[PDB]
Each structure stands twice: as structure tokens, then as C-alpha cells.
Design a protein around this ligand. Structure first.
Ligand SMILES: NC(=O)c1ccc[n+]([C@@H]2O[C@H](COP(=O)([O-])OP(=O)(O)OC[C@H]3O[C@@H](n4cnc5c(N)ncnc54)[C@H](O)[C@@H]3O)[C@@H](O)[C@H]2O)c1
Ligand SMILES: NC(=O)c1ccc[n+]([C@@H]2O[C@H](COP(=O)([O-])OP(=O)(O)OC[C@H]3O[C@@H](n4cnc5c(N)ncnc54)[C@H](O)[C@@H]3O)[C@@H](O)[C@H]2O)c1
Ligand SMILES: NC(=O)c1ccc[n+]([C@@H]2O[C@H](COP(=O)([O-])OP(=O)(O)OC[C@H]3O[C@@H](n4cnc5c(N)ncnc54)[C@H](O)[C@@H]3O)[C@@H](O)[C@H]2O)c1
Ligand SMILES: NC(=O)c1ccc[n+]([C@@H]2O[C@H](COP(=O)([O-])OP(=O)(O)OC[C@H]3O[C@@H](n4cnc5c(N)ncnc54)[C@H](O)[C@@H]3O)[C@@H](O)[C@H]2O)c1
Ligand SMILES: NC(=O)c1ccc[n+]([C@@H]2O[C@H](COP(=O)([O-])OP(=O)(O)OC[C@H]3O[C@@H](n4cnc5c(N)ncnc54)[C@H](O)[C@@H]3O)[C@@H](O)[C@H]2O)c1
Lengths: 364, 364, 364, 364, 364
């Protein structure tokens, strides 16, 4: 692969291949940047056809988590674990005890959380070996009201961008998927008093939506052509593709879905038309904020006060996009890199007793 | 300025000029005295025309905080920070991360709090770099009921000075400004059963006052000439000036406003007439007590029990003023300096494991 | 002075005005940069006519120590203390106990050493209050053989620059001043087998030089016109001025004197002629290396092995000067700033247990 | 006094004379025995005519607290402080800050609490200097329900001694004094369903007693001659004197009063008659148990479960009194000394990490 | 005795009566002042007729050690232990193990050393229980060359006072007693080249003195009338009495004997005549400096460099005596009290990590 070429083109710190034979563990931990703080990342268990599939996937997700944690305002880096196995039939205790010792042997340099493939029952076996695991605690045990609240605030900011007013009484919001994250979103949007147009691949969830908030049951294939204001995709990625760009009649795209643009040329075309696209990983970053506020000792009010700042994050993305005459998906990356370089240069004076995110401190 | 002459005439320990270029921070931390404990002080952000304006302002406020923290009964010194900038447009994260590291590099020798110009959203960025910051905690998050309760107790003490009885059923209290601190004061004064005469530059707050407690709406320019007993200024400083001294018909001045006397000759004239002036920084010291009780781990009952002692503080000020045949604004300074010198001499025996206000101790 | 303008033009971290009234201390500690490590600097006691004289002097010496400690290879920053007093009649214990507590209250952020005005009898009073003081220890108690050894190595490097050969058998070295630092230098130069031409304002030291190593007694005013190879000034600063540049018949200037060029235009003219000027603060940095190796627990062999690298330091200065087509006194500053920026960027990965120069570690 | 003779006859460890001149403190701390644990004792402020009065008083109370803390089941020794002053007019902050440093300088070897003469407002000034102070905490802030509950349990045990049955439905209890400790006692005695005969020097408290529980208002001088079963003195000491022994018609004396027997010959005569006298410092030891359970972090259920054991303490006193053919006031001392000697001999095996009552341990 | 009156007239911190019955220990520890540091004092074992004899003796020696440790330049207070027993027949291990635990229970607040009555074989039993004991270590094991060296330096200073020249070639020194401390003194005085006149109650030591350095054997009763310059008493106290003042023909009294003046009226008469009396506890303080330098880890060169400063101590005593127009034995007390008050006021700024003499620090 010439793996140091791929590392050198993007400045990856480490890739790290763990293995354990009596338990059957093959894991790839990738730490991209640990400038702001420790590298928080999800632990994803999935079956890949080779090692190179898993390696490329771990490297892309490490870069993505660095820009997410930076542009969210967290003092955390970016990394990602891939466990090569099958989560239906290739789990036991022994691989997670082996894996928790491989995390404890990095000495706090990498913090893990649950992701696609692991549950909060495998981060209890890891917690028996390490402290550097999050999303576990009896105080904590559910990021979906948090992610919905952050999508709500980002939609406020994008509405003040595209229109000037953020009071959404008198707006039309089309929402695809009502799966636990757009559901609380639809709670927030009707409790403000906005009109809702929902769809889903199921109908029982659509029946729940119409019974709760009087939404409009529309078929899933033509959610794209609905004349609305704010289109909020919450189902999958690759939704904005070449096959669907002229189908839109909305000017504000702000949803919780990951990897919304299929190719960056689509983002170029959206910026040439005029659809106000707030970027994908700045809006939906509420769940990562929620699971990173556990590192203080979890408190609901502090974490919701931090999730409230996604309004300001989106507003700075649009300010940089209008200053630099670039699209907004480029403005998100440049916001994050400016925060990384500025905190490299502004935290340079010597202290022999500095605080990081894992520090021992006063109870207060 | 010959800055060591000004430091030597009043025994300032340190002045300390912080600077950071990539974040735009220019700060002046002034530590006057750290005999009793660490130097607690506010962090004030304001735009000054030069450096000398900010320097003179920081030095005056450092001396003022030393006498306030001493005469309140706290084990804390006096200092003050001035950040030279514009709080409407010259804030970001990077200057407060730089500034929090400059506080952490004093090693607990200076504790900061919010003041005129900063909020409790900038002491969360400082808290990511240091423990020596107060007014932040999720247990804590509001000094105004505390400051009003302390003004109430000091008015009890001044009423027992001027009359002998502290039960205020049958008294007349004129209050200017109903802005969040005299409001709870008016709650306390009518729940004792005293008659209220309020005024304000607004009328909606006056309407709220009349609707709540049946106060008397009087115009703001002639609040000074109202025949009353206890005049409680709660709006600005420089109220007692030469233009308004013969306007008074009250004999007890006890309000929460800072810098009440314009010049000390006015205090000389008040003492020559006979108006019982309890001093400004002894009465309104309840908010500093509230934000300094957080250093124990915040508890409401302990802090209110400590705010209750402003009765005794005012009573000792009047005892020293009658012992020493001086005015009361001089009696406040001499009370504070006697407490400083007595705790210098009475805490002189050696211990290798002493407790200060920042010490680690048993949870209990 | 508009002191933040002068701080912002050169990126000073702190200026810090200490004062103590019962002991008579007025001190100015200036910390320029603490990127590489703590700020090591001398404590200089001298009488200045005002505060502004002392302030300008402290600021210049702080910048000079930053570039010296950087270009020497040390993990130390640059700072400087000025005590405003008279060392003949205004010393006692009480000001150094007060001053040692003001250094201990920076928490290791600034390390002090002896300099022009203090002795190793005032850094014993400071040592009773702090650990952040160097040059004191009973293992240690004499930087002059170290500084001479470093001047010897730098002269080796400048001789290989100007000629190609470093074996100095068959060279002519003119040395002014034989005061304890050029004396061991003349030991090294005749034990290699090089011819010496010494001078001094005294004659008894010249008699000692001629009796020891057979040097040539030449008058002090015409040491400049002596036809030689390597001219080694070791007396004062401002030697290379406009009045003496055409007097030289030497092509290698390498001496232990501080502030050799009077103005940088003189360095421009030296580079236009062709005299190989190795810069002043790269050669004579052996004494600072000697007093900074005490921070490990002093060992003579490790410190001499570190002083041996001034050959490589001079060789990199000449490599940058030939790469960048600038003079050598500019090449020294650019070497130091490249080392500062490169160690800012190469030590950026997170550790929660990093080592600095003041760290506790294994005895081994 | 030949003070070491008095110390040697009873094995006092230390007497310790503290003094502070600028605050006016003259204190006598007496530590009798610290075998079981640290010496807990009250701090009593009172005016004595000389030093010898205070010294004899401190020595008697130190021995009394050793036998109380031993026979109660606590891991605490016995000591006592006497401050020589006047609590009406000779208190300030400075003497308690001086005194708290003199307690902190014993290093946990002596723990102080409130007693006759100090309040819980002087153990807040001491708490600013030391951890070895009890009865202060915001969790804690009232030993009187505890002392009453313990008197109730001891009366249960004495009733099973004198009769065999502990169910007190159908008994007659005469109680003198209804001052906050016999009041909750009378609550417990009527909620079991026992008949009450109360008296007091006041009548309003007697009116409260008759209105609450239907007690019988009897004059205070002839409470001694009332035909009853269990006489419970709760007012003063010296009640059982020669003038009142034939006045009794009761066979169970069990009250919360200190120093009940005037001379031990009275206890000899009570044991010769047959009145079941449970001793004074075994019954009323509930308040000391309450203020010593704060040293764990105060919990109400654990402390009440420990106060419940006074039944077993009284039962062992009567078992030793019937085994050894001695009176019961001698049986209390011998119970305590057997516990002291047995815990000297049974805790003799070496540990390098033992637990005492002041130890740091797991939160759990 | 009214022991708090005697404590209050001189500001004694503590008197502390230890006792242990199974070992037979009766000890009186007196701590006078612990402002400068911990209280260093000797442990003296002697038989006194009562307690009051021992108590008065302990109090006088505590005050004397405070002024000695202050005027010597040490960071140590003054205290003194008296053990009431007979050192010929009333020692064992058990009393020193009991006593070492009573010193460890003061927590470093009092440091003990050997004195009249104990040896360095009883401070090995104490060292098995505590660290706060000095004069014991295998590095250490002999204050007499130190005390002689300090007497030599003080005699240098008194010779420059009385004459102007300190080079003692051509002087006459009469020395009584040649017992281990004047012996090394006579070594120093003839190795400078001064003429010696020795005497002693023995003759074999006088024969050793004449054989070594050619001294002059003079009878012991008329050592006082010898026409000399510097009279150096080294035998006992009470030498300068009314019976011997006109016998002197010397003008410089500088010897190592304790308690040289019988009454202070004798010192008044010496100052009225003109005999330059350097005070007793400033000259002979070399042994206390030697045993207090062990607290750093003992090093001979550092301790001798500190003993060298007795020249400067005597010079400041004479400067204060000529400034204040008082005798010199009063000038010694006022030098010490000025050092105590100045270090109370100059070490007042807050640090949470200060160094004292018992602090843990870097090995270096
Ligand atoms: N929960 C969080 O905090 C968080 C964080 C980041 C991203 N997200 C993203 O939010 C999206 C959904 O959230 P979730 O995974 O937590 O719950 P979810 O998977 O239950 O919600 C998805 C629902 O969308 C519907 N769906 C599937 N295909 C669809 C299609 N073509 N068209 C319309 N609807 C379709 C289904 O009802 C599905 O249950 C996901 O893309 C997830 O990655 C969530
Ligand atoms: N909150 C505290 O704990 C605390 C502590 C110390 C001092 N203070 C002082 O209390 C004063 C007011 O308290 P605040 O700042 O917290 O709330 P605030 O500023 O809202 O109250 C001030 C109100 O007074 C009225 N006002 C302005 N000018 C007036 C004028 N000429 N005449 C009459 N009323 C006028 C306005 O209604 C104003 O809102 C201030 O001077 C403040 O410095 C408060
Ligand atoms: N010792 C070190 O480690 C070190 C470090 C850095 C710089 N230096 C520099 O080295 C120089 C001298 O070293 P030093 O101060 O340690 O010992 P030093 O002061 O005793 O040596 C200087 C001697 O030069 C002679 N001198 C004075 N004026 C002269 C003149 N016009 N011409 C010729 N000679 C003259 C005198 O003999 C003088 O004693 C100084 O400039 C010092 O700053 C020394
Ligand atoms: N509160 C405790 O935990 C505790 C602990 C140990 C001992 N005690 C003892 O309990 C006794 C009383 O308890 P307290 O001090 O806490 O409250 P208290 O002092 O208010 O109760 C005493 C009351 O007894 C009455 N009194 C006074 N003289 C009397 C007399 N000749 N005859 C009858 N009644 C008389 C008065 O009403 C008095 O208020 C005291 O002797 C106290 O020492 C209490
Ligand atoms: N060793 C120290 O560091 C130190 C410190 C402080 C004080 N001193 C004092 O130094 C004095 C002697 O020193 P030492 O005790 O260590 O050794 P030491 O007791 O052996 O020296 C005293 C000698 O003086 C002689 N002596 C006794 N009576 C005499 C008399 N009337 N006239 C002349 N000589 C007489 C004897 O030879 C005696 O041995 C003592 O007063 C001691 O208190 C010593």
C-alpha cells in the first residue's frame, strides 16, 4: 500500500495493529492527530474482505473524527478502531479483555466509545481493564435527544443564514426517516410551531408521526421533490448525488445523516446554485459532545449548554465561507484546521502542571 | 509613571503584564496583598485609551478588593485583572485559553472570578486550563439574593446603631433602582413589614414593584429629598456629592452601590452632620462571600450563614468609629488593617502541614 | 512607554514587577519565551537612573537569552531579572528571601542564576526559599574552563570554515585580555601547539602569559593591527566599531566577549569584506551549558560532552549563512528561530506524563 | 502541685500549655490515654480563679472522657481542653485561629468538639485551621435525640435487670427537667406506652409536657419521694447525696445527668440497699457516639445503629457487677479498663498499613 | 508559679509535660518561638530537686536558644527539653522509645539534639522512632573543631573592632582551659602566628600545649591579671563577676564559654570601661550551626562556609551597639529580635508550596 506514503500525505501520527491468538482479536487502531487532546474515537466491529479494506476504512474515519472533534469545540483528537470480525458470532469476553489491555497500554492517549458494531455491553468488559472508555457509566445509562437538539440549533443557524429570522413559526420542514433522532427533532420543530412533512420506509412510524404532530405522510421516493424550505435528511449517506440534485426545491439542507455529499463536485454544484448547505459533521456533532462530557463526570445541564453552541459553530462556518469565497464543506475543514493551528500556537507557554481532559482536579 | 513609587507607597506585591500575540491578549493582573490567603479578584474586560488608564484602574481595584475581602471575614487577599480589549468584538477562545494558562502559572496565588465585562461563558474556557476560577460550577449555576440578604443584615445593624431597635416594622425605606439586587431587598423589607418608596429610570420595573409590595412611585430626581429613615442607593457611584448632601432628610445610608462617596470630604461632612453612614464595601460584600464559598464545594446553607455576619461586621465598624473618633469610612479601612496585622501575628507558629483556602482535606 | 507595543512587536510572554517594602526589593523579571522549556536567566543587580532604563535593559537581555539558549541546544527558554539597587550597600537577607519566594511563586516557570551584580552567596539565600536556582550546589562549587573549552571548539569550527583544516599547529592567534577565560583558552591553544600573541591592560598577567606559554607581549592599542589569523576578543563589547574595522588583518573573529558588534551595519561590512565572523552568543555559550547541566544533578563528563557540540553549532550557522545568502549574525537568529518552531511542531503529540527539564525521574 | 506525681498516679500521657499573646489565648490541653485511638474531647471555655483550678478540672475531665469513650465502644481516647477566659466578652477570631493551629500541630493526636462554653460558631474558625474538629459539618448541622434514644435503651436494659421484662407498658417513670434531652425521652416513653411523672423549675415546659403526653405535674422539691419505678434525673449533678437517699421509693436510677453520685460512699449505700443504679457515663454516652460517627462521614442510620448498643453496654456492666461482687459504678471503670487492656494485647501483630479512626480509605 | 504569667511576659508558645509510667519518663519540652523555622533544642537529662527547678531551667534555656538560633543566621526556632532523672542509673531503652514517640507526635515542630546529660547513644534509640533528631548520622559521626573555628572568626572580628587590623601576627592571647575546644583554637592561633598564654586546672594538658605550640604555663588563679590583648575564657560561666572585673588588663573578651556575665550590671560596667565584649552566644554558635547543617544531608564544606559568617555576625552586633548607644549584650538580643520581626514581615506573601528546613526537595 506504501502505507507511510498515505500517512505522510495527511500527517497521521500512528496506525497500530493489535492481535491476540487465544481470543481471536485482530484490531486496527488509528490515531490521526492528538494536538488538542486525547484521540476520542469509536470502536467499530465489522467484517472486511481483507486487511486493506479495514485499513483504508480506519484511516478515513480517523481523519473524519479529527475534523469533527475540532469543529465541535472539544479538547479531543481524532482516532478510530476497527475490529475485524463478525459481531453476530465472533464475540466473547476474552477479546475485549485483551483489547482493553491494549487500550490501557497506550496510557490515555486514545479514548474509545461505542460505534457501529459494538454495544454498551462490550464497553463493560473494556471498562474492567481501562478507564479510557466512554458511554458506559451508571450516571449516563442515549445520544439521540442530544443529536436532535443539536440538529435543531444548527437548523436555527441555517435559517438565520438563508432568511435572517430564526423563529421558525411559519416554515415547512421535510424530514426523511423517523428513527429515534429525527423523532425528537420533530418534537422540537412542532413545539416551536413549524409544519412537518415526514416520510420513512415503514408506515407504523409514519402513523406515529401523524398521530403525534399532524405531519404529512408522503411517499419515500418523492420526498426530494416536495416544495419546502428546510430539507433534513436523517437516513443514510450519498443522498445528494447527481441523480437527485435537480429534484430539490429547498434551499436549506440541515440533517443528522453522515456523509451526505457523494462527491465534492456535488457540493460545488450546490454552492453554485445557492442551496444553503450547512455541513454534515458540524450539525450532527451533538452525540459526540454528549459522550465527551462524561469525561468530567456526567452532568446533563453542562452537556446541553455545550450542545447549544452548534448555532455559533454553523455561524462561523458561514462567516468563513463568505470571507474566503469557497463552498461550505471546504469552510468546515478550514475552520477546524484554523482551530488546530491556533491552539497549537496559543498554548505554548510552559507549565509543569497543566490540565488536559483526563486530569485529576478538585471536586468542587 | 515611576511605577515602583506607586507600588511602594501602598505595598503592592506584584503587577504582572501578560501578552499573547496569536490570540490578541493584553492583560494586567495586579496582586496587592496575599497575607490572609490567595488573592481573589474579578477579571474585567474593557477598552482603555492607553496602558496607563488600565494600570491605574487595576491598582485602585486591587487595593479595594483587599480591604473588601479583609473586612468581610474571608481568608482571601486582594487582586484584580484588567483585559485590554473590546468585549463586543474582541473575544474568542484563544485569548482565554492563553489567559487561563497564565493564571495556572501563578500556582494558585491568584483566583479569578467574573466581573464587569466577562460572563459565565468565558469562565468555562478558563476552567479548561485551571482550577483557580470561581463562579462556574454546575452546583453553583447568582449572587443577587446573597447581596440583597447582606444589605438587609447591614441595614438591621445600622438601624440598631441609629435607633436601638432592629425590628423594622414601622420604618420608611427609600430605594433607587430595582435592578435584581434591590428587588430581593424589597422582598425582605416588606416581608418584615416595612414601608417602601421605590424609584427607577424605568417604569415597568416600578409597576412591578407597586404591584408586588405596594410601594410608592416617586420620580427619580427627587428621591433624594424624600422624608424617610433609611436611604438605600443601589444604582451607581458618586451619588453622595456636594450637589446632593443638603437634599437628604435621612439619617441611615445603607445600599449596595459601589463607590458611594465621591470624595472623602463628603464623608467628613456626613460624619459632622450625623447621618449614620455604614460604609459601602462592608454592606454589599455578600456576593463576594457567595462566590468565595464555592472554594469549599458549594453549599447554600453554609454560605448564607456566613452572609449573616454582616450585622457583626457593621457593628464592629461602628464600635471602632466610636472608639477612635474618626468617620466610618476610615473605620472600615482600620478594621481591615487590624484584621490583616492580627492574622499576620497570630498565625506565626510553625506547621509543616498547614491549611489554606485551597487545601486538600477530608470529605466529611 | 506603551509597554504592550514593545511586548507585541517581539512576542514577550511576561514582564513582572516584584516589590517588597520592609526589605527594599524592587525587581523586574522578564520572561520572553518558554516554548522549549523553562526560562533560565541571570539575576543582575545594578543601579539604574529610572525604571525605564531597567525595563529596557531587562527586555533586551530576555531576548538575547532566548536566542542563546535556543542556539546552544538547551531545553530552556529565555528570561532575565533586574534588581534595582546598589550591590555595594543595598543587600541583606530579607530582600533575597522575599525574592526567592517570588520565584517559587511562578512554579518552576523561571529558573535563576548568578550574573553581573550577584555572587554565589546570594544564591544560597534564594536556595533557602526555592529549588529553581542554579550554580549553587556543593557538587558544583566555575564556568570559565567550560567557556574557554567552548571557545576552543568554536575556533576549531571557524578555522575549518575559513581554511578547511582544523589542526591548528601552525596558526597565529591574537588574544586580548587574559582574565580567567582567555587564560584556559591560551592553555588549550598552546597544548595544541599554536602561536599566541596576548595583551592586557595589566602587565603582571602578561608576564604570567609569557612565562607560561611563551606568548608575545604587544601593546593593547595596537592588538587590532597585528598580522595574525584568528583574532579572539575577550575583554568588552563594542570592539568591532567603525573606528577599528580597517585596522584588522585577521579573517577569523572568534572570542568569548559579549555584544561584539556595535551596530549590525558593522556585521554587514564584515560579511562584505570576507572576515569569517562566527557569532558572539554561539561561541561563548559554554558557561550557560555548564550551569544548565546542574539541573540533572551535576556531572562533569556529561557537561563537557555537551560543550563539545559548539563545533556543530558553528558549522550549522555557516551552513545556513551559505544557504540563505545572509550574514552570519543573522544566521544565528534564524538557526535559533528554526529550532524553536521545529520543536513547537515536532513535540505536539499528546502525552499525559511528559518529561521537561524539571521532571522527577529514575536515579539510574 | 508536683504535677508529675498527679500524672504518674493515673498514667496521664500529656498536659500541654498553649499560649498566644496577640490574641489572648491561654489553653490547657490534657491527653490522658490514646491507646484505643485518638483522644476525643470537648473544648470548654470558662473563667477559673487561678491556673490550678483549671488544671485540676482538665485532669478530672480527661480521665472521665477516657472511661466514657472506652465503655461506649468507640475507638477513641480521652482528653479535654480548658480555655481560660470569659465566653461573654473574651472571644474573637484570633484566639481560635491560634488554637486551631495548636491542634493541627499535634498531628491528629487530639480531636476537639464543642462543650460547655463554646458553640458551633467557634468550631468553624477552628475548622479553618484543622481537620481534627467534630460537630461542625453541613451534613451534621444536634446530639439530644441521640442522647435521649440512648437513655431509652439503657433504661430498657436496667428494667430487664431489675424485673426481667423490658416491655415498659405498665411502668411509672419520674423525670426531672424537660430540657431538650428528657423531652425526646418522654416522647419515647409514651410512644411505648408508659406513665410519666414530670417536673421542672419552669411551668411552661411542664404545660408542654402535660399537653403532649398527659404527664403529671408534681412540684420539684418532692420529685424524690414519688412512689415510682424508674427515676430518671436529667438536670444536674450531686442529686444523689446523703440528704436525699432515704427519700427515694424507686429501684432503677437511669438518667442523662452528668456526675450523679456526690461521693462514692453514696454508691456503696445504693448497692447495699438494692436500687439498680446503672452508671452515669454509660447511659448518657449517646451524644459522644453521635459526634464521633461524623469522623466516617456522617450517616444517621449507622450512628443510630451504634447508639442502639447501650443496652448491651449496660448488660455487660451488670454482668461484671454480679461476677465481681462490687458496685456498679466500680463495674463501669473495670469494664472500660478491661476493654483498654484487651485491645492493647489483641491488636499487637505488625501491619505496616493499619487503619485507625482518621485513616484514608475507599469511598464504597 | 502562675505559669501562664511567666509565659505571657516573654511570649512562650508551649510548655509540654510528657510522662510514661512503665518506663519512668518525666520530660518537660519547652518551645519558645517557632517563627523562623522548627524549634531546635538540646535534650538535657539531669536531676532536679522538684518540678519547679526543672521548669525554670527549661524556660530560660528555651529563650536562650531562640536568640542563639536567630542571631546565628539559622532558619530554626528555640526550644529545650529537660528529662528529670539521673543519667548514671536511670536510663534504658524504654524511656527513649517513649520519648521519641512524643517527639514524633509533635510532627516536626521540634527537633532534638544531644546536650548535657545525653550522648550519641541515646539519640539512636530516639532515631528508631523519629526523624526529628540531629547529631546522629553515619555521615556525621564532633562539634569542637567547628566551635573553635567560629571562635577564631569572632576573635578576628573583635580584633578589627578594637584595633582595625585582623591579621593577628603580633598579638597576645590568654586562654583558660584547653579542653577540646580551646585546643583547636590554639592550633588556629599559632598557625596564624600569635603568641599564646594557656592555663588549665590540669598540667598534662598544659604540657601538651607547651610541647605543641610553645605556650606559657601560667597558674590558673592569676590568668585574669595577665597583661595581654584578647582574653578567651573557655571553662565555665560566671567568670566575669564583681570579684574579677578590676583584675583584667585585656580589652577583647571573646571565648566559647556559656553564660559569661554573672549579672547584666557587669556588662554595663564593661561597656563603661571600654573592654570590647563580643557577646557569648554569638561567638560560640558554631556547634549549633554544625549540627543544624545535618538537616540538609551533612556536607563539611557547606557547614564550614556557614560557620565563616560569625565575622559578619559580630560586625553587625558592633554596628547596632554603636548605632543604638547600648551595650553589646543588649545589642545581641536586639539583632536577634530585628531578624525575627523582619522575617515575619518579609515572608508574608502566600505560597501553597513553600520550603521550610524539613522540606523534601531535589537531590541535585
Ligand atoms: N444517534 C446519533 O447521535 C447520531 C449521530 C450521528 C449520526 N447519526 C445518524 O443519524 C441516522 C439515523 O439515526 P440512527 O441510526 O441513530 O437511528 P435509525 O437507524 O433507527 O434511523 C434510521 C431510520 O430511517 C429510515 N430509513 C432507512 N432507510 C431509509 C430511506 N431510504 N429513506 C427514508 N428512511 C429510511 C428507517 O426508519 C430507519 O430506522 C443515521 O444515518 C446515523 O448515522 C446519528
Ligand atoms: N449583584 C451583586 O452582587 C452586587 C455586588 C456589588 C455591587 N453591586 C451593585 O449593585 C448595583 C446594581 O446592581 P446590578 O448591577 O447587579 O443590577 P442592575 O444594573 O440591573 O441594577 C441597576 C438598575 O438601577 C437603575 N438605574 C440606572 N440608573 C439609575 C439612576 N440614576 N437612578 C435610579 N436607578 C437607576 C436601573 O434600573 C438599573 O437596571 C450596581 O451599582 C452594582 O455595582 C451588586
Ligand atoms: N566566564 C564566562 O563563562 C563568560 C561567559 C560569557 C561571557 N564572558 C565574557 O568574557 C569576558 C571576560 O571574562 P570574565 O568577565 O569572566 O573575566 P575578567 O573580567 O577578569 O577578564 C577581563 C580581563 O580583560 C582585561 N581588560 C579589561 N579591559 C581591557 C581592554 N581594553 N583591553 C584588553 N583587556 C582588557 C582585564 O585584564 C580583565 O580582567 C567578559 O566580557 C565576559 O563577559 C565570560
Ligand atoms: N444533650 C446531650 O447530649 C447530653 C449529653 C450528656 C449529658 N447531658 C446532660 O443532660 C442535662 C440536661 O441536658 P441539656 O443541658 O442538654 O439541656 P437543658 O440544660 O436545657 O436541660 C436542663 C433543664 O432542667 C431543668 N432544671 C434546672 N434545674 C433543675 C432542677 N433543680 N430541677 C429540675 N429541673 C431543673 C431546666 O428546665 C433545664 O433547662 C444536663 O445535665 C447535661 O449535662 C446532655
Ligand atoms: N564543644 C562545643 O561545641 C561548645 C559549644 C558551646 C559551648 N561550649 C563550651 O565550651 C566549654 C568547654 O568546652 P567542652 O565542654 O566541650 O570541653 P571540656 O569540658 O573538656 O573543656 C573544659 C576544660 O577547662 C578546664 N577547666 C575546668 N575548670 C577550669 C577552671 N577554673 N579554670 C580553667 N580551666 C578549667 C578543664 O580542663 C576542662 O576539661 C564549656 O563551657 C562548654 O560549655 C562548647
Amino acid at each position: 500500500m506504501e502505507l507511510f506514503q498515505y500517512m505522510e500525505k495527511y500527517d497521521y501520527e500512528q496506525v497500530l495493529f493489535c492481535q491476540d491468538k487465544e481470543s481471536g482479536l485482530k484490531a486496527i487502531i488509528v490515531i490521526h492527530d492528538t494536538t488538542l487532546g486525547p484521540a476520542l474515537g469509536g470502536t467499530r466491529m465489522w467484517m472486511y474482505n481483507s486487511e486493506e479494506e479495514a485499513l483504508e476504512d480506519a484511516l478515513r474515519l480517523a481523519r473524519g473524527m479529527t475534523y469533527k472533534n475540532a469543529a465541535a469545540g472539544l479538547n479531543l483528537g481524532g482516532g478510530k478502531t476497527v475490529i475485524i470480525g463478525d459481531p453476530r458470532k465472533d464475540k466473547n469476553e476474552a477479546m475485549f479483555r485483551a483489547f482493553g489491555r491494549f487500550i490501557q497500554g497506550l496510557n490515555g492517549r486514545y479514548i474509545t466509545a461505542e460505534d457501529v458494531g459494538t454495544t454498551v455491553a462490550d464497553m463493560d468488559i473494556i471498562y474492567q481493564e481501562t478507564d479510557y472508555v466512554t458511554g458506559i457509566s451508571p450516571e449516563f445509562g442515549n445520544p439521540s435527544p442530544a443529536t436532535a437538539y443539536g440538529v435543531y440549533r444548527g437548523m436555527k443557524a441555517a435559517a438565520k443564514e438563508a432568511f435572517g429570522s430564526d423563529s421558525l413559526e411559519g416554515k415547512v420542514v421535510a424530514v426523511q426517516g423517523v428513527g429515534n433522532v429525527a423523532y425528537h427533532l420533530c418534537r422540537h420543530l412542532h413545539e416551536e410551531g413549524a409544519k412537518l412533512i415526514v416520510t420513512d420506509i415503514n408506515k407504523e412510524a409514519v402513523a406515529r408521526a401523524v398521530e403525534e404532530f399532524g405531519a404529512k405522510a408522503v411517499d419515500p421516493n418523492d420526498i426530494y421533490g416536495v416544495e419546502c424550505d428546510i430539507f433534513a435528511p436523517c437516513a443514510l449517506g450519498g443522498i445528494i448525488n447527481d441523480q437527485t440534485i435537480p429534484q430539490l426545491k429547498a434551499k436549506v439542507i440541515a440533517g443528522s445523516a453522515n456523509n451526505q455529499l457523494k462527491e465534492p463536485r456535488h457540493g460545488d454544484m450546490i454552492h453554485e446554485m445557492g442551496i444553503v448547505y450547512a455541513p454534515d459533521y458540524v450539525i450532527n456533532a451533538g452525540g459526540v459532545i454528549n459522550v465527551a462530557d462524561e469525561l468530567y463526570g456526567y452532568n446533563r445541564e453542562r452537556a446541553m449548554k455545550k450542545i447549544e453552541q452548534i448555532y455559533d459553530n454553523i455561524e462561523k462556518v458561514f462567516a468563513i465561507a463568505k470571507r474566503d469565497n469557497i463552498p461550505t464543506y471546504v469552510a468546515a475543514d478550514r475552520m477546524a484546521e484554523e482551530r488546530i493551528e491556533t491552539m497549537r500556537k496559543a498554548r505554548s507557554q510552559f507549565l509543569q502542571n497543566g490540565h488536559h481532559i483526563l486530569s485529576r482536579r478538585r471536586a468542587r
